[PDB]
Amino acid sequence: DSVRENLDKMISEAEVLNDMAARKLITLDAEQQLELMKSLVATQSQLEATKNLIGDPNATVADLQIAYTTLGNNTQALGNELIKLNPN
């Protein structure tokens, strides 16, 4: 069972959705652009925090665990937002 650092996995997943979202961004009208932006910025914010945290070789098994869970939840939500715009 993988170390608390299958964040590396969540981290690289978050990056990719964030990239995808920044592209769906220009192609959207205001109302929808803002919906996406709200979840994108949140994911971007959390990702950056998670990156800082894992830089601290100390931290804790909990703070890391929260980071993973939160970053995951944000990433998950961005996914649904992306699907909600272009089911494709």
Curated annotation (Swiss-Prot):
PTM notes: Glycosylated; occurs within the cytoplasm. It is probable that most of the Ser residues in SSR1 and SSR2 are O-GlcNAcylated. Sequential glycosylation by sugar transferases are able to generate complex sugar polymorphisms.
Effect after changing residue 40 to A: Loss of adherence to SHA
Phenotype of the disrupted gene, per the record: Loss of fimbriae on the cell surface, loss of adherence to saliva-coated hydroxyapatite beads (SAH), an in vitro tooth model.
Variant or mutagenesis effect after changing residue 15 to A: Loss of adherence to SHA
Localization in the cell: Cytoplasm; Secreted; Secreted, Cell wall; Fimbrium
Stated induction or repression of this protein's expression: Low expression in early log phase, it increases until stationary phase (at protein level). A monocistronic transcript.
Domain of life: Bacteria
Phenotype for residue 19 to A: Loss of adherence to SHA
Function: The major structural element of fimbriae. Required for adherence to saliva-coated hydroxyapatite beads (SHA), an in vitro tooth model. A Fap1-dependent increase in adherence is seen as the pH is reduced from pH 8 to pH 5.
Family in the record: Belongs to the serine-rich repeat protein (SRRP) family.
Domain statement: Has short and long regions consisting of (E/V/I)S dipeptide repeats. These Ser-rich regions have 28 and 1000 repeats respectively.
Annotated protein name in UniProt: Fap1 adhesin
GN (gene name): fap1
Residues of the full protein shown: 209 to 296 of 2587
